Amino acid sequence: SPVERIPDGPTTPEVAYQMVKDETFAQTQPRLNLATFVTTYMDDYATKLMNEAININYIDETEYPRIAVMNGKCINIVANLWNSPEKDTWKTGALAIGSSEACMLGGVAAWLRWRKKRQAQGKPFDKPNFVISTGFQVVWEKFAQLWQIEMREVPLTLEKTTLDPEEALKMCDENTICVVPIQGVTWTGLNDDVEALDKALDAYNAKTGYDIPIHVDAASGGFILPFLYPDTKWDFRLKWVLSISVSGHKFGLVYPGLGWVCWKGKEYLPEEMSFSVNFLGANITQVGLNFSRPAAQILGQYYQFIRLGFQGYKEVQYNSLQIAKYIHGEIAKMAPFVNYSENVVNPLFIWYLKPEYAKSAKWTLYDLQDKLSQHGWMVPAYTLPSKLEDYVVMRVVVRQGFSRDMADMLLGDIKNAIAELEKLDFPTPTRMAQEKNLPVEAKMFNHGGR
């Protein structure tokens, strides 16, 4: 099996197929993987649709003109789900491979709008920055490094478990390109209060004239809030929310390879970033980092919109949230645990050990992670971001297909693991590491990217 160089000659297809097969099987049962956000199941019709589109190159507008139009209609639907006030029927948005590229497009657009303002004012524009919670996902560090834009982080505390508007404004100045609240903080599952941030930013912008906008990183929540919390003002209903991004392959219910970013209107997307055509009466604007890319995920997204509709999406996310609330409530009743938040607003949540319990416990949540691994679960344990770095938490994500029976299966295994861990005569290795104030490698993938 070639490690360094290409084989000199060919091998038969049957042998090559097995050789690749032998390195691509899952390490554990994916249905017991509670660490990932990403969709792993679509129905037979969606899968057949996307498998047959494996050879469709999305960028060829002459061969597949109506797939370009269908991309524009998905953008319309997402933008109207987020209550875009734009008057054109064809809304301003871009397809992406994930929230990663969608966030960067939002950040680049905010940066170019800021450069244009400061130039028109005669102010310097060489040291831009943006403001974000320490609970950011790694893509914002990629954005900071690849564009050389300073990242200013607002710490989490037990009194301010999400981005606090007052503390975010203390880090803003004439060089701030935007503030980034997160809907579905990957580390905590909570939503930054966008409406409170908008209220604070409006008063701050009138006092300063800096006109600092908001980009909402809604990788998870972007497909939860419109269906379950329609009255929560977090989107384009707010004055300073100029762009929003989301992962289509997390709670949009599509196989990996899908993200969306929308802008409040065409005038918040700088001219440098877009090229526009008129393909079959539509208004198709071309934005993005890629050229050639697979088109299958567009078909999957459009299939889901038609197959589920608003009510269909609402029932799926509702069932995920109910089972999450159920696990969240049962965890709270167990002596060792306390929840990070009393509210479950996305189908994920975190808990940690009560301080008084951890003091005398001979185990840590890393040992609980290992106990569950022995039964096939992936339930990640990790430390929280800055100012809460001493808190080891455990996170459960409830995706579509995770039934009430499987939730009782998980709670049964947690109770049995606690019964073993509580009878330990001596501290575990990770328990002693905490006593010595030595870091513990997180090991298990948790989507944070850190």
Instruction: Report the binding-site residues for pyridoxal 5'-phosphate.
Output: 99-100, 247, 249, 292
Shortest distance, position 35 Cβ to ligand PLP, whole Å = 12
Binding residues, by number, are 99-100, 247, 249, 292
Q: Which amino acid is at 7?
A: P
What is the rounded distance in angstroms from the CA atom of residue 89 to the CA atom of residue 398? 35
The b-or-e profile of 26-51 (16+ CB within 10 A means b, else e) is: eeeeeebbbbbbbbeebeeebeebbe
| Residues 286-305, interacting with ligand PLP (CB under 6 A) | 290-292
Joined together, the tokens standing for residue 42 give 């679509």
Long-range Cβ contact pairs of 409-412 (< 8 A, separation 24 or more): 410/34, 410/327, 410/377, 410/379, 411/327, 411/330, 411/331
Q: Which of 228, 305, 222 is nearest to 259 (CA)?
A: 222
Q: 184 touches which of ligand PLP, a second copy, none (CB within 5 to 8 A by kind)?
A: ligand PLP
275 is a contact residue toward ligand PLP (CB under 6 A): no
Work out which of 35, 149, 197, 393 binds a second copy, going by CB under 8 A.
35
Q: Is 166 or 267 the residue whose CB approaches a second copy more closely?
A: 267
Task: State how beta strands 176-180 and 129-133 pair.
Answer: parallel
| Separation of alpha carbons 328 and 155, rounded Å | 25
- What are the Cα distances from residue 172, in Å, to 119, 145, 196, 449? 19, 19, 16, 26
With tokens 């130039």, the residue in question is 119
Report the 10 Å Cβ neighbour count for 288.
17
For a second copy, which is the closer residue by CB, 12 or 158?
12
Q: Which of 81, 172, 216, 219 binds ligand PLP (CB under 6 A)?
A: 219
With CB under 6 A as the contact rule, the residue among 32, 35, 37, 296 that binds ligand PLP is: 37
Residues 378-417 that bind a second copy (CB under 8 A): 378, 401, 403, 405-406, 409, 412
Q: Does 142 bind a second copy (CB under 8 A)?
A: yes
Within residues 429-448, the interface with a second copy by CB under 8 A covers 429, 432, 443-445
Give the residue, chosen from 122, 360, 425, 438, that forms a contact with a second copy under the rule CB under 8 A: 425
Which x/- pattern over 97-136 shows residues binding a second copy (rule: CB under 8 A)? xxxxx--x---x---x--x----------x----------
**Taking a C-beta distance cutoff of 8 angstroms, is the pair 87, 252 a contact?**
no
- Tell me how far apart the alpha carbons of residues 277 and 332 are, in angstroms, rounded to a whole number: 55
Euclidean distance between CA atoms 321 and 326, whole angstroms? 9
What is the contact mask toward ligand PLP in residues 225 to 264, using x (rule: CB under 6 A)?
----------------------x--x--------x-----
Query: What residues between 137 and 176 interact with ligand PLP by CB under 6 A?
Result: 137, 139
Q: Which does 348 bind (CB under 5 to 8 A by kind): ligand PLP, a second copy, none?
A: none
| Angle of CA points 212, 218, 221, to nearest 5° | 140
Q: Where are the beta strands (DSSP E) in 325-369?
A: 337-339, 348-353
Examine residue 185 and tell whether it contacts a second copy (CB under 8 A). no
In the window 313-372, what residues touch a second copy (CB under 8 A)? Answer: 313, 370
* Residue 39 contacts a second copy per CB under 8 A: yes
| Contact status: 98 vs ligand PLP (CB under 6 A) | yes
22 binds, among a second copy, ligand PLP, none (CB under 5 to 8 A by kind): a second copy
Where does this chain bind ligand PLP (CB under 6 A)? 37, 98-100, 103, 137, 139, 182, 184, 186, 217, 219-220, 247, 250, 259, 290-292, 447
